[PDB]
Amino acid sequence: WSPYQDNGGTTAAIAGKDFVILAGDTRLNGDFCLHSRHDQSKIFQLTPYTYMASNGMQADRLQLQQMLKYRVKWYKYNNGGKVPSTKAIAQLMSTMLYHRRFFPYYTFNMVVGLDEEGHGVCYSYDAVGSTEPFLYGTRGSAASFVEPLLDCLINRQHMTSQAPPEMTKEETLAMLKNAFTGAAERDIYTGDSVSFFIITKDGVQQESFELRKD
Amino acid sequence: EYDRGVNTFSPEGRIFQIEYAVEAIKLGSTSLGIRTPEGVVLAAEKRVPSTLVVPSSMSKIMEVDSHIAAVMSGMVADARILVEHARVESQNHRFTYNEPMSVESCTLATCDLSIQFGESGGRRKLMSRPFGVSLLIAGVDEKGPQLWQTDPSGTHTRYDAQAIGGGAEAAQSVFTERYHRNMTLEEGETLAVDILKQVMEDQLSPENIEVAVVRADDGKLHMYTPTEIKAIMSR
Amino acid sequence: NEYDSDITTWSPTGRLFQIEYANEAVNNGSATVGVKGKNFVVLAALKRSPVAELSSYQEKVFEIDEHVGMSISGLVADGRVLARYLRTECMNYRYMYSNGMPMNQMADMIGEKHQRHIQCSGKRPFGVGLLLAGYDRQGPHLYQTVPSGDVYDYKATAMGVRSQASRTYLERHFEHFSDCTLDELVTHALKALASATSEGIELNVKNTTIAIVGKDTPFTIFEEESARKYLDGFKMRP
Amino acid sequence: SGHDQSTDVFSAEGRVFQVEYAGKAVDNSSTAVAACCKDGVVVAVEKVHTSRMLEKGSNNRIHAVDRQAGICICGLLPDGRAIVSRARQEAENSRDIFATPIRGSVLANRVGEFMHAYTTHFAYRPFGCSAIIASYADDGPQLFVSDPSGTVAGYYGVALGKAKTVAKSELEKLDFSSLTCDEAVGKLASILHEVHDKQKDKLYEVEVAWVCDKSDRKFVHVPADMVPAE
Amino acid sequence: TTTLAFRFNGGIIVAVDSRASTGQYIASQTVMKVLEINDYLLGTLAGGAADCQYWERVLGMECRLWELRNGSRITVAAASKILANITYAYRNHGLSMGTMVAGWDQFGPSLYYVDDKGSRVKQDLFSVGSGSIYAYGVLDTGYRKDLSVEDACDLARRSIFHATYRDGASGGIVTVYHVHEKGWTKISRDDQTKLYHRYFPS
Amino acid sequence: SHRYDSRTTTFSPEGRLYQVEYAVEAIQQAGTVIGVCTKDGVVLAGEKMVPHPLFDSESMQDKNTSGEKMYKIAEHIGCSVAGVTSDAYALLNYARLSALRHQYTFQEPMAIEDLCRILCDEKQLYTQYGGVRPYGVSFLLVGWDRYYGYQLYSTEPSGDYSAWSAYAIGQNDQVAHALLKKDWHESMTLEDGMLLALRVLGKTMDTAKIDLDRVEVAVMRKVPASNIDQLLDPFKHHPKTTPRFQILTRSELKPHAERADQAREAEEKAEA
Amino acid sequence: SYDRAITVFSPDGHLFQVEYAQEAVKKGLAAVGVLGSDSVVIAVEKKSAVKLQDSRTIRKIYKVDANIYLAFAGLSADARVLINKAQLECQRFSLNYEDTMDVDMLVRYVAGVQQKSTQSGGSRPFGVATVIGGFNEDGKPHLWKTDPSGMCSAWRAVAIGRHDQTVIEYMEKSYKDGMSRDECVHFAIKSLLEVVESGSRNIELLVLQYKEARYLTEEELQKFVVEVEKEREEEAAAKK
Amino acid sequence: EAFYGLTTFSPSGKLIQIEYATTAAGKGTTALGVKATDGVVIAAKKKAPSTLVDASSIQKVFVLDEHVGCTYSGMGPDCRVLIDSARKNCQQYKLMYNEPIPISQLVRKISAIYQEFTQSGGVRPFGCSLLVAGVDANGYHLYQVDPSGTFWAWKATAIGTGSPDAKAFLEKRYTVDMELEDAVHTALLTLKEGFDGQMTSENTQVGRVVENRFEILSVDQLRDYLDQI
Numbered sequence A: 001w002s003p004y005q006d007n008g009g010t011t012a013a014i015a016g017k018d019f020v021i022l023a024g025d026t027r028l029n030g031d032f033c034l035h036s037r038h039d040q041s042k043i044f045q046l047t048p049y050t051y052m053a054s055n056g057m058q059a060d061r062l063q064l065q066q067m068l069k070y071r072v073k074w075y076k077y078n079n080g081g082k083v084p085s086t087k088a089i090a091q092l093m094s095t096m097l098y099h100r101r102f103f104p105y106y107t108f109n110m111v112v113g114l115d116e117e118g119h120g121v122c123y124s125y126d127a128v129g130s131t132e133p134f135l136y137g138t139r140g141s142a143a144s145f146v147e148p149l150l151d152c153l154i155n156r157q158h159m160t161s162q163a164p165p166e167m168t169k170e171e172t173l174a175m176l177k178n179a180f181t182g183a184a185e186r187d188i189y190t191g192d193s194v195s196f197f198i199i200t201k202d203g204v205q206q207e208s209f210e211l212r213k214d
Numbered sequence B: 001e002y003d004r005g006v007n008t009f010s011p012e013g014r015i016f017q018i019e020y021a022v023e024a025i026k027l028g029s030t031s032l033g034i035r036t037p038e039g040v041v042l043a044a045e046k047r048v049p050s051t052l053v054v055p056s057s058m059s060k061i062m063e064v065d066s067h068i069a070a071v072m073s074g075m076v077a078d079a080r081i082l083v084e085h086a087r088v089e090s091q092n093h094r095f096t097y098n099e100p101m102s103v104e105s106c107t108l109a110t111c112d113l114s115i116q117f118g119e120s121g122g123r124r125k126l127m128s129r130p131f132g133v134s135l136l137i138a139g140v141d142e143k144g145p146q147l148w149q150t151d152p153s154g155t156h157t158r159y160d161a162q163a164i165g166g167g168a169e170a171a172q173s174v175f176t177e178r179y180h181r182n183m184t185l186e187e188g189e190t191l192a193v194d195i196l197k198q199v200m201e202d203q204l205s206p207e208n209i210e211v212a213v214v215r216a217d218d219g220k221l222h223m224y225t226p227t228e229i230k231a232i233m234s235r
Numbered sequence C: 001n002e003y004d005s006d007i008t009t010w011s012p013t014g015r016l017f018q019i020e021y022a023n024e025a026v027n028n029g030s031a032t033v034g035v036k037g038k039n040f041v042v043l044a045a046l047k048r049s050p051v052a053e054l055s056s057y058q059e060k061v062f063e064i065d066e067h068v069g070m071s072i073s074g075l076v077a078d079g080r081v082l083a084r085y086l087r088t089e090c091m092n093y094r095y096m097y098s099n100g101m102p103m104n105q106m107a108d109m110i111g112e113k114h115q116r117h118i119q120c121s122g123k124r125p126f127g128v129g130l131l132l133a134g135y136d137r138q139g140p141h142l143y144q145t146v147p148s149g150d151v152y153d154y155k156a157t158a159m160g161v162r163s164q165a166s167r168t169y170l171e172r173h174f175e176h177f178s179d180c181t182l183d184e185l186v187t188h189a190l191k192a193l194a195s196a197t198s199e200g201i202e203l204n205v206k207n208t209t210i211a212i213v214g215k216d217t218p219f220t221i222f223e224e225e226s227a228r229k230y231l232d233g234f235k236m237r238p
Numbered sequence D: 001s002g003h004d005q006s007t008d009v010f011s012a013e014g015r016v017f018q019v020e021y022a023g024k025a026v027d028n029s030s031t032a033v034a035a036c037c038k039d040g041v042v043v044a045v046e047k048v049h050t051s052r053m054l055e056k057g058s059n060n061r062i063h064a065v066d067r068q069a070g071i072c073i074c075g076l077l078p079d080g081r082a083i084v085s086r087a088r089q090e091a092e093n094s095r096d097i098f099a100t101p102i103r104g105s106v107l108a109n110r111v112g113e114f115m116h117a118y119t120t121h122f123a124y125r126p127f128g129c130s131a132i133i134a135s136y137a138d139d140g141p142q143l144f145v146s147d148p149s150g151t152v153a154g155y156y157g158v159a160l161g162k163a164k165t166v167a168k169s170e171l172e173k174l175d176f177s178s179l180t181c182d183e184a185v186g187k188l189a190s191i192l193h194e195v196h197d198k199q200k201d202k203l204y205e206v207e208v209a210w211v212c213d214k215s216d217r218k219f220v221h222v223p224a225d226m227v228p229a230e
Numbered sequence E: 001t002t003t004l005a006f007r008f009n010g011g012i013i014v015a016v017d018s019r020a021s022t023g024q025y026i027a028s029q030t031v032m033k034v035l036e037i038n039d040y041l042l043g044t045l046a047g048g049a050a051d052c053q054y055w056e057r058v059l060g061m062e063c064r065l066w067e068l069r070n071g072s073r074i075t076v077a078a079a080s081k082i083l084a085n086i087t088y089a090y091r092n093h094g095l096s097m098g099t100m101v102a103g104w105d106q107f108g109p110s111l112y113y114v115d116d117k118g119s120r121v122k123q124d125l126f127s128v129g130s131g132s133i134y135a136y137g138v139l140d141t142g143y144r145k146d147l148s149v150e151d152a153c154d155l156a157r158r159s160i161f162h163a164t165y166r167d168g169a170s171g172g173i174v175t176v177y178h179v180h181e182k183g184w185t186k187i188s189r190d191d192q193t194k195l196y197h198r199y200f201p202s
Numbered sequence F: 001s002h003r004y005d006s007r008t009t010t011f012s013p014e015g016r017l018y019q020v021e022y023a024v025e026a027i028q029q030a031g032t033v034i035g036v037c038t039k040d041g042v043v044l045a046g047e048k049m050v051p052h053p054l055f056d057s058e059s060m061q062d063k064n065t066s067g068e069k070m071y072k073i074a075e076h077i078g079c080s081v082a083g084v085t086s087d088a089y090a091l092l093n094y095a096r097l098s099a100l101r102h103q104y105t106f107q108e109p110m111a112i113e114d115l116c117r118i119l120c121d122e123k124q125l126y127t128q129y130g131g132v133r134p135y136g137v138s139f140l141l142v143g144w145d146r147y148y149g150y151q152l153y154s155t156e157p158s159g160d161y162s163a164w165s166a167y168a169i170g171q172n173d174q175v176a177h178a179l180l181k182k183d184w185h186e187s188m189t190l191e192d193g194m195l196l197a198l199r200v201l202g203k204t205m206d207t208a209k210i211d212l213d214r215v216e217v218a219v220m221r222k223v224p225a226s227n228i229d230q231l232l233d234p235f236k237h238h239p240k241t242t243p244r245f246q247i248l249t250r251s252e253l254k255p256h257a258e259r260a261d262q263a264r265e266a267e268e269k270a271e272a
Numbered sequence G: 001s002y003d004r005a006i007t008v009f010s011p012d013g014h015l016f017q018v019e020y021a022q023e024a025v026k027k028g029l030a031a032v033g034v035l036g037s038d039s040v041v042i043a044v045e046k047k048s049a050v051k052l053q054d055s056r057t058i059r060k061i062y063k064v065d066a067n068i069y070l071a072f073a074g075l076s077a078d079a080r081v082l083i084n085k086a087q088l089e090c091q092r093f094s095l096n097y098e099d100t101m102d103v104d105m106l107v108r109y110v111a112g113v114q115q116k117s118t119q120s121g122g123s124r125p126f127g128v129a130t131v132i133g134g135f136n137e138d139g140k141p142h143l144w145k146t147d148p149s150g151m152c153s154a155w156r157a158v159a160i161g162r163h164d165q166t167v168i169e170y171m172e173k174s175y176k177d178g179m180s181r182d183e184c185v186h187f188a189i190k191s192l193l194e195v196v197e198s199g200s201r202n203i204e205l206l207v208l209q210y211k212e213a214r215y216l217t218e219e220e221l222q223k224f225v226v227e228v229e230k231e232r233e234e235e236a237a238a239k240k
Numbered sequence H: 001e002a003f004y005g006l007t008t009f010s011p012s013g014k015l016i017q018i019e020y021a022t023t024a025a026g027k028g029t030t031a032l033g034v035k036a037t038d039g040v041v042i043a044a045k046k047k048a049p050s051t052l053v054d055a056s057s058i059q060k061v062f063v064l065d066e067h068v069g070c071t072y073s074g075m076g077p078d079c080r081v082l083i084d085s086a087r088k089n090c091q092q093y094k095l096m097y098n099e100p101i102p103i104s105q106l107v108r109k110i111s112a113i114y115q116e117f118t119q120s121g122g123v124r125p126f127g128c129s130l131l132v133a134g135v136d137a138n139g140y141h142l143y144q145v146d147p148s149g150t151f152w153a154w155k156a157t158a159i160g161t162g163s164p165d166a167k168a169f170l171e172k173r174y175t176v177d178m179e180l181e182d183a184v185h186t187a188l189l190t191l192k193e194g195f196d197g198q199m200t201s202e203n204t205q206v207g208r209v210v211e212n213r214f215e216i217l218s219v220d221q222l223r224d225y226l227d228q229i
């Protein structure tokens, strides 16, 4: 008996100019069986413009979500109703991840939200809290599949062709759908149905997308 | 006298110790604070015991953070520990949440200590008496320039123009008039220095008093040197 | 009188004089009035008035969770001690059972927290009274705590300085509250509150807070900004 | 002098004045009465409302302690709440450690023992409330009373409150050997209305609970339409 | 990881790569190795990114507190001893961090190296990391005290570039910082491959 | 309860600590003990109570550590006590433990001024915390160390100590003060020091023909070193002479007593 | 343990324990410390030479750190227990930061202890007021003064102990800014002696320069006390 | 929990609480003890409160170990505390040094509790004065502790009510070269001279330490001397 376990899954975000597309696959698998195909315990909404999407062990992320939600509530009560910013939430989460440094959380996290000037930004953490702000990013078992694909269509390196126009919500959504349909066909633990969260300034919308069930 | 304890209630409902500690405030040096759309201003009289003291050692205006200043009155022996507390809490809030603390949160963190008095130790060590000091915090956060006040009660109160210390009674008289809501920082300078001129037994000198200002656009604390106070008196 | 020196001393007439003094701390705080309807609860608190140009602003109304809230009266330096505890406990409960703590359980928690402080030597009673406002499966609840530790499930109440007139008004209209709607509830509450102010002072957005909590409505405080919907049209018609 | 200021001071005649002063505060509380009717127990308490806006169900003095035992606290309500919480901690232990419902007499003994640990120390004050414990365990119906002195005693019919003598003179003439709870819920309820004075308190209301075989040996509040109107 | 800093007549020069490899997979190519503690001190990140980030942020809180209390900037010799005590207290908890604190206090520039077991040395030439063994080679043979600020910055840039080229655990964007008496300024920040066709053209 | 609190540790309206003043007034009724610091030794001469006809002595082997008035704190530190007797033993045990723990840590004899400070901090500690009475006792420590040779300190029941060349505490100590400051010179040997002691002792309790049942003397000098076993630690330099605190019996005081009363009658014949 | 509140507020807002400590200070031995251009001097009253104190010397200006000296006024035992705390703090500081403690930080720590005493349970305030002089590691002579109330403050020529206000308000009108090394030793005596008896053997003086602090010997002090008494008698002949 | 002190100095410099405690420790029954070159004798007086007291069970001569005895005069319930701690300290010494504890260390240890209670917080001083006796490597001993904490190495002493006359009688009938039976006889004789009636074998209780051990006298052994004086 070891207190750790990996429940597979994957998540991936792309930040735009005034939005962020967050995506997480809804699939929960245990030791060798498949617990559920409707697992919605990956993407957790902290504030109306901030989300945390985490992979790894499921109990640890169900615990960390509550710890972060209560820290956000304390911050809201002490500051007279001022909902914290994405930057504050990301630094808070790093500090929280490092306190349990000797019996760690088995999660890999992303704090996806909007900055103050309106631009969207993503964060990425290790198991202990090495945060780094960035513009896209994927975590989970399907990381080494999706990351190099996005690296090649967004950064547009190694192509002697003038940079295309800035990608909008629909184009980014389609690109991320491509990435997930491609990763659901080569990873055994990934993909029964993915959930997309389009975070914009006038609130957030939500969509689903269906993959192969094998 | 020790007949009634530290936690006894008076027949009028107010605790004896906190009612006495508020009386000790009017024995101290006066102080001001004026909030304006451009910034906030904190003025105070050092009230040196002799002409020999190097006055820059009895600064009544302590910096709690690059955007949060605090002026006190009463017994300045305690106020230093309240200021170290506010500094530690503000630095923690910058270390954890990575952004400047809000002034009202600093005032909460100060009263949270100032309430913890009692006599029975048991689990936690307490203060044997309230702090005989009434702070006055001022700062600039996203909610604009803000001035908060604190009593030994543990009761924090946001204001627009307040006076503590001895000559605060006539100071509130000078306050009720001569103060609209949308003044200029220079107008606040003139008004505060006038008040100090009015309610002090000593003669107002650029080395006699201390003035600090926190401007909104800059968003930083800017303590005045004697020459700048001379520039204000010459107006 | 030498039988009020301690909180652990009974007068020959079986009286606790320290607690009878602590009640005078509530009887001298800012007036507040709570009114419970069929699906909504409305608290209306009278804050401090501006001195002709300057606005002193102190937090009397608190939110404890999505469905709870409390308006304190008396010494605020104790109201915060209790609001921190109530928030901590409603969070410890929402963490275990993932649902809002019922009012019938929170009132008892407040009662015990009070009573624990009126039986030892090195303690003192909280000189602060609460007006709890909540909504759960069983509908809206309006309590009122005193320093002695009691808790009273009320239909409509008022406490603070010169709150006797607020109660004298409320004890005529409190039979029709189960039918008056939200606007009518807030109007009854404001009319009852304005009956406790000074002579030449009237209610306006500058010196009134209105908190509301109901079935589909999380606890919302209302200050100057949107109080005008209930406050800008308001006359104390005798 | 000062010989009546703390609980750890015997008077010149060996009396602990502070506990007599405590009991004096119970002698001035709302009326309660109780009957052990050889097949169940019935407790009935007077609730004196100070306000006519009080919701029915507020300041209920009868609290359940286990499935079968209940406590009616005549006296200071907050202190009665502490005793009720302590009795609840004592009854849950026997249901946890010893896998058995706590016997009524043992519960009364423990509640008295806890009430008495506050009248020995110089740093506490005696509870200002007398408890009426009504239990029905596997040992039959039991009705005990605990005074602020910490002394417990089992009764057949007990009266407490401000009007305690005339309300006790009513219980002498019941039978208590053939008396059934189904009629006792009427008898005691009428006794309280007879003893209650109404030119002092304009608002009053009677709240009664019972535990017998009809309620599956469970301490519950009386069905609403079982108390006579007045 | 490759990190270097050397002292000369004109200040201190820090230079870093920007890559964080988790074994054989490259996590990111934009990690920021130079954590500016304050407006006067520079700390570098090598080893465990979590440990370095956390403890240098703690040190930047403590230097600011020191400045608030006494009213004077903290010195490098004391700002480096704080980190040495922090690290030495946890010498048996498995930290992994080697950092370099470089500053310009009121005793001229100072440059200390603080290890993960509490080691604390003061030299004028350091290069920590896994590609460090490739920096020293090109660093020791060109380093001399009297370098012009641009000549020394070029030495540091050309020395990191050779560590990024032979080592698989280093690369990305080479960044060069300068520490003088007025504070510190980021000199340059350039991609590792645009440097290759600039040093070995044709 | 808090109403019967005597509040020992409080400042009175005139900055005076009443309990410490009462301790001082308590020590004044205790037995007078004097101590003179010569150049080749230091003497403590005190007076013990009248011997009841039924008193016995604990037949103690090696009787050089504890007399009736003077005690030994370490191989090179002796002390004398004045005040509440049974309270002095707690501090005496504490001081023995202190002067042994320093030798456990540093392997060197603790110097008098270190110990005199380490047991006066204890006497002060009670004057500021705890709210219980202070130790109502006064000391006279005598001893030898390589730093200042023969030292002699004096203690107050308030934590303050002072180094004296010849001091006296107890009954009539203001008399022995004016008498010791009268006749004491630096060039005074040990045996002439002892003559100064008993002489001024008899004068303080008013006895002509000084008695040998009511007096106790303890001398602290250097004797030649004894147990130097150099063959068991060939790199340990043992000094050639070590200090030894020694309490005087009846057989060896009577020679010094007959010369004290003889000096008395000498300085008495010349009064006319 | 025993932690009953001792220092509590009076019906006028006066801490009786603190006022009573400040009264026990007034009954002590004076101590005058003045600040010069490149050296700071401190003079202590040295209660008396009673012809009975050990011929060996014992000092009354205590070395708190290699560059920070202290001179107390008040109750002696609490003074020693405070000096020991200060000496422990200096050595802990020059172990957590490798840098010698400045004067100002030591004054702040000692004033923190002083104040913590007046807000703790079961402890009365220290009855000591101290003068702390020293040099930072860049010259800059500093002179500070604490009170039993815990309010530290930096001065330029301070006196503590009995007849405090007399000496302060006398030597405030006779202090010239930027004195020389032999001016201070003359200005320290001439001001202190306004309270002490004419006896020249109850004065103990210390001069403190950058990286050097030496005590002035008996004949050195006599050379200056004679000059001081002559100037005072000349000022008297000028009075009349 | 009443951590402050009850006994405090007074303007005259007297721990007057200790004087009250020493008066309270002189009101009990009269005990006495004498020494001789062969051993020590302790003799108490079991004053029975009533004929229904079972004189067998009340005891005033307590064994502390194989070589030490004791007897008190004052508050019995207080003396139980000191006896219970003294036996523990006597067993802890044999545990660590494997040697019968000498009397002097035993008295120093139990005279350290008197003082610890005259200076602790929230406690009152003890009200009983002991009479320790016994043997060690350097002869026989008889000490007499007090509520103030002091102890004295007597040769023949008496405590309780009727002490100033019992010690006066002991001054005269003592002899420096007394054998042991002389001591038993003189103890019983000075008790009779102060006895209110005539003592029986169950109205007194003596303990005589002989050559290695304490051995409280039995009823028949005690009788054998009672009807011979």
Ligand SMILES: Cc1nc(C)c(C(=O)Nc2ccc(F)c(-c3nc4ncc(-c5ncccc5C)cn4n3)c2)o1
Pocket (backbone or CB within 6 Å): E001, E002, E021, E022, E023, E046, E047, E048, E096, E097, E098, E113, E115, E116, E126, E127, E128, E129, E130, E131, E132, E133, E169
């Ligand atoms: C003065 C001086 N001279 C030298 C040469 C040093 C030095 O080496 N100090 C140092 C101290 C602690 C560390 F922890 C490190 C350190 N640096 C690293 N860089 C990269 C990886 C790594 N990363 C990913 C995968 C695999 C590996 C091996 C690991 N480490 N460990 C380096 O100090």
